[PDB]
Amino acid sequence: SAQSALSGLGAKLLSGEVEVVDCTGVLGPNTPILQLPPDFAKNTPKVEIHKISEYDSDGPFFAWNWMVLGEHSGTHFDAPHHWITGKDYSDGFTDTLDVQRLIAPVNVIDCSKESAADPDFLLTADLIKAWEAEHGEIGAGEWVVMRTDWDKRAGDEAAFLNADETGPHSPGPTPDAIEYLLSKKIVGWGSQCIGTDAGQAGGMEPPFPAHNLLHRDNCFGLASLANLDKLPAKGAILIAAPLKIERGTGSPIRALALVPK
Amino acid sequence: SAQSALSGLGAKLLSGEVEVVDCTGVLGPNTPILQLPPDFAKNTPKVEIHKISEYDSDGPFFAWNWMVLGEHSGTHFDAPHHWITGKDYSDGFTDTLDVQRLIAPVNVIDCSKESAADPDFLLTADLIKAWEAEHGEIGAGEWVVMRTDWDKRAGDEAAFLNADETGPHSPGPTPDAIEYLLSKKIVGWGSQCIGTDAGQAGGMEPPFPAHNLLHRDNCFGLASLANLDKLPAKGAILIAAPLKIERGTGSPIRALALVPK
Ligand SMILES: [Ca+2]
Ligand SMILES: [Mn+2]
Ligand SMILES: [Mn+2]
Ligand code: NA
Ligand code: NA
Ligand code: NA
């Protein structure tokens, strides 16, 4: 019974037998933001928070703010329209995508040890297959996220981007890794890095394969995910819903996970 | 078992035996925004969406935007710090509150007929108790939302604020209603209007009782909820999570509910 499922869930939430895990980083001026080559493209802006009032002459009984905020800021969601490969989907925007897809079991692939050894670590199809053999098949409509514990760098932007003369160095997936996931008909793929692709994904074929391939198939991306170390490899539910921005290509989100405990 | 519950949930989402309802309105320049008396307070800004690129020379392979965005914009969450009565709660901010509380069963109180006949319709404690008598008691930690079908005016700000010479006219709770809900230890209160209080709440005692009393008790408010007409009175889970804005007083949200079908 669908209803007993929901009531059961409501009770376990209230009792804490199902724990809500906060998978989101702090959104503010110090939030790390993508930096692109300025001869390649314009930058998304840094986050600004402007006071309107704080129990004062501008607003006696209340405190509130407004913001300068890019769609693609902090922990955030990538809609298919965000990439040329997904431009023609009429349901590829934040205000037109199908919300039934947004909530699903999540596969948490732990690559944190590898990531620390090599900042340019790449998750491959063979490695995903190995993970499947240990933990279980990745299923249709499920979330797949790469845990790297990159969020430990979220307090310092330079370290979070981890760039040198050759560019950003941060972990991510190979092109074949993404193709293989898309053959499993997943809903989307997520990272704890600045974007869904490795830092060095500009020199990949195709460039930015996560972005390219995910959106080609009308699938979603998630970036700057926090606290994937508190999720199990299998069995959690990921909730990742963008603001309903008009013709939005993306949005910051409050990524939440449901885990047993 | 919590795990058997989560897996069951996942399966039912996939099969659509559990339906995800979008309770959020579109977030854009035409999104209705609160207007306050100019000799009383500064306003929160209208939403602006600005293009960064759309597969052009500003960004060849991608489309994205940035926004001018008030915390309190469209379908949105009120954190306790928003009111003077909640200013001292250290967990009263979008980034300090307890996400365990954010997902809970929702009581949907249908006031659409009365509201249609009386734009100034007030929901009272007595009316709420009669409601409880028919559908079941309101429980600790639960959401309570007032369905007015006000979202039908969302296409026209003037009709949505519904103001005349004496101010906004839109449905809301009495102080007695809010005081009663608080005795039930609810998590928070939501409306389909521009805010949690009736348009005429300024002349209430105390002024803006929803904002005042909810936040006094470290509770939450939701405003501009869409599609409450798609929800059942009982049995549904509401997910309403704010962006993790640093010291945020509130946030636009992508309100989503889980209903059986
Ligand atoms: Ca390179
Ligand atoms: Mn992005
Ligand atoms: Mn508000
Ligand atoms: Na006031
Ligand atoms: Na402004
Ligand atoms: Na590119």
Binding-site residue positions of B for substrate: 61-65, 211
- Resolution expressed in Å: 2.2
Bond from prior residue into A173 cis (ω within 30 degrees of 0): no
Query: How is A138-187 classified by DSSP, letter by letter?
Result: --TT-EEEEE--GGGGTT-HHHHHTEETTEE---EE-HHHHHHHHHTT-S
Catalytic member of A82, A135, A169, A215: A82
Integer Cα distance of A250 and A81 in angstroms: 8
Please, is B165 exposed, middle or buried when counting C-beta atoms within 10 Å of its C-beta (0-12, 13-18, 19+)?
A: exposed
Q: Does A2 touch chain B (CB under 8 A)?
A: yes
- Among the listed residues A149, A146, A186, the one whose alpha carbon sits nearest the alpha carbon of residue A25: A149
CB distance from A222 to chain B under 8 Å?
Answer: no
Range of the domain at A125: 1-261
Structure tokens that stand for B125 in this block: 């404690």
- Cα of first residue to Cα of last residue in chain A, in angstroms, is 23
Q: By CA distance, what is B73's nearest residue in A? A: A66
Cβ contact B95:A26 at 8 Å: yes
Rounded to the nearest 10 degrees, the angle between the axes of helix A2-15 and helix B2-15 is 140
CB nearest A66 (choices: B21, B70, B260): B70
Beta carbons of A88 and A75 less than 8 angstroms apart: no
Q: Locate all alpha helices (DSSP H) within B17-172, ordered by sequence.
A: 112-117, 125-135, 157-161
8 A C-beta contact, residue B196 and residue B228: no
**Distance between CA atoms of residues B202 and B83, nearest Å:** 14
Q: How far apart are CA B219 and CA B238, in angstroms?
A: 15
Question: Contact B82/B248 with Cβ under 8 angstroms?
Answer: no
Compute CA distances B161 → A243, B150, B154, B157, B254, whole Å. 22, 10, 9, 6, 21
A13, A245, A246 member nearest B104 (Cβ): A13
Residue A106 neighbours by CB under 8 Å, 6+ apart? A142, A143, A144, A145, A231, A236, A237, A238, A257
Spacing, Cα B45 to ligand 5 middle (Å): 5
Q: Check: CB of residue B193 under 8 Å from CB of residue B224.
A: yes
How many degrees, rounded to 5, is the angle at CA B83 between CA B141 and CA B85? Answer: 80
Query: Residues with Cβ < 8 Å from A158, sequence gap 6 or more?
Result: none
d(CA B40, CA A108): 51
Q: How far apart are CA A129 and CA B37, in angstroms?
A: 62
Alpha helices by DSSP H, B39-194: 112-117, 125-135, 157-161, 175-183
For residue B241, the distance in angstroms to the closest alpha carbon of chain A comes to 6
Token code pair at residue B47 = 């939403």
Both tokens of B128, joined, read: 């709420």
Experimental method: X-ray
Sequence-separated (6 or more) residues with CB below 8 Å from residue B247: A28, A49, B81, B93, B94, B95
% helix, strand, coil for chain A, step of 5? 30, 30, 45
**Phi, psi torsion values for A4, nearest 5 degrees:** -70, -25
Chain B's closest residue to A100, CA to CA, is B20
Task: Please state, as a whole number, how many other Cβ atoms lie within 10 Å of the Cβ of residue A198.
Answer: 27
Decide: B54 and B231 in contact? Cβ < 8 Å.
no
Answer whether B244 sits within 8 Å of A44, measured CB to CB: no
Within 8 A by CB and 6+ apart from A218, the residues are A80, A86, A89, A91, A92
Cβ count within 10 A of residue A39? 5
Question: Where chain A is broken, by preceding residue (C–N > 2.5 Å)?
Answer: none
- Inspect the interface and report whether the beta carbons of A253 and B258 lie closer than 8 Å: no
DSSP for A24-70 reads: ---BSTTS------TTT-PPPPPPEEEEEEEEETTEEEEEEEEEEEE
B49 alpha-carbon distance from chain centroid: 22
Q: Which residues of B touch A194 (CB under 8 A)?
A: none
Q: Contact at 8 Å (CB) between B228 and B147? A: yes
CB atoms within 10 A of CB A227: 17
Which DSSP category does A84 fall into? G
**Pick from A135, A110, A78: which is nearest to A231 by CA?**
A110
C-alpha span between B185 and A219 (Å, rounded): 40
SS3 B60: strand
CATH, residue A253: 3.50.30.50
Nearest partner of A181 among A152, A151, A143, A233, judged by Cα: A143
| Whole-number Å distance between alpha carbons of A135 and A116 | 23
**CA neighbor of B257 nearest in space, from B102, B139, B135:** B102
Looking at beta carbons, which residues of chain A come within 8 Å of B107?
Answer: none
Both tokens of B259, joined, read: 């209903």
Distance CA B41, CA B29 (A): 22
What is the number of domains present in chain A? 1
Query: In what helix (H) or strand (E) does residue A9 lie, and over which residues does it extend?
Result: helix A2-15
HSE-CB at A13 with a 13 A cutoff on CA atoms is 30
CA-to-CA separations, A219 to A82, A121, A143, in angstroms, rounded = 11, 23, 10
CA-to-CA distance for B41 and B52, rounded, in angstroms?
Answer: 32
The encoded tokens of residue A124 equal 């491959």
Q: Could you say which DSSP state residue B47 is in?
A: P
Backbone φ and ψ of B7, nearest 5° = -65, -45
In B, minimum Cα distance to A74 occurs at B244
How big is the A-B interface in CB pairs under 8 Å?
A: 288
The Cα–Cα gap between A207 and B59 comes to 14
Element (H, E) at A112: helix A112-117
Q: How many CB atoms are closer than 10 A to CB A36?
A: 14
Tell me which DSSP letter residue B88 carries: T
Tell me: is residue A63 an annotated ligand-binding position: yes
Q: Which of A195, A120, A53, A30 is nearest to B44 (CA)?
A: A53
